Amino acid sequence: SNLIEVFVDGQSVMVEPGTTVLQACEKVGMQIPRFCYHERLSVAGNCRMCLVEIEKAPKVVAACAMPVMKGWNILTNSEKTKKAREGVMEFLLANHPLDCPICDQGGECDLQDQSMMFGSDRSRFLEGKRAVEDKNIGPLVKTIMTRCIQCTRCIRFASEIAGVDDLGTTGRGNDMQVGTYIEKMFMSELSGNIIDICPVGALTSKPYAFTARPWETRKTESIDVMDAVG
Amino acid sequence: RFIQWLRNWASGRDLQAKLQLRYQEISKRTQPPPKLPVGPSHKLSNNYYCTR
Ligand code: SF4
Ligand code: SF4
Ligand code: FES
DSSP states (O other): OOOEEOEETSOOOEEOTTOOHHHHHHHTTOOOOOSSBOTTSOBOOOSOOOOBEESSOSSOBOSSSOOOOSOOEEEOSOSSSHHHHHHHHHHTTTSSOOOSSSOTTTTTOTTTSSTTTSSOSSOOOOSOOOOOOOOOOSTTEEEOTTSOOOOSTTHHHHHTTSOOOOOOOEEETTEEEOSOSSOOOOOSTTGGGGTTTOSSTTEEESTTTTSOOTTSOOOOOOOOOSSTTO | OTTHHHHHHSSOOOSSSOSOOOSSSSOOOOOOOOOOOOOTTOSSSSOOTTTO
16 A cells, blocks of 8 residues: 555565655665765755666666656666766766875765775876865864865755855856855854765864874764753 | 816816806896886776776
């Protein structure tokens, strides 16, 4: 009742009528690459990394924002999907500078755990690499806005849960930027909690800045006691 | 000389295959700067992933 069997790689599963292709393929234990998407946020689509070749169609669709019709064959690995996940993640790895000796998210960036598995082998660009300038906002958010692959993820968070309407999009085409037009500081509750959301190492912590790389720590779970909600 | 042929009566006679390469006709040095060819499908427009 209230379901459609969709053959995800030729294998049945019953979802709600009106869910997403991403949640369907994640239900059967698979990962499609995720840049312009978050579960705890709204949904946009302007990275165009999830691209699956749907069966009985010459075109390619993106799994972020579309419903699922009567049961398709969501052909995950094809000889054309790998001509797309290689495709998009060759452009955005060009207009970007050669950091990571010094990029402080250097052990967990999503241009670094996608780029071994998916994507191409070498480069053919071979000169270019625009370089914008940075600024300061508060004494907590160490700020390199050069890297900033414009996935529109920090931007919606101002309209999301933290209701401070502060950020925007300034520019057109190749040249757009993310930061505040005026030099207004941005600080309230949750204001230091953006540096987890930024999926590359363009945003990071100010006191933590230059200490140690994230493959030497020992992750032990615990609880903080500085408030009554735990 | 007379100490020479006593080495040539004993255990045959070699006179050329010395146990040292310390003399001449050991390769001393090499001049040119090297450059390496980059061959195996390193190029573009056909060399392309999902084929390899
Ligand atoms: S901070 Fe950088 S990575 Fe994060 S949403 Fe803005 S442009 Fe994209
Ligand atoms: S954030 Fe990504 S692209 Fe930038 S230096 Fe780190 S791994 Fe490289
Ligand atoms: S993954 Fe966000 S649009 Fe393709």
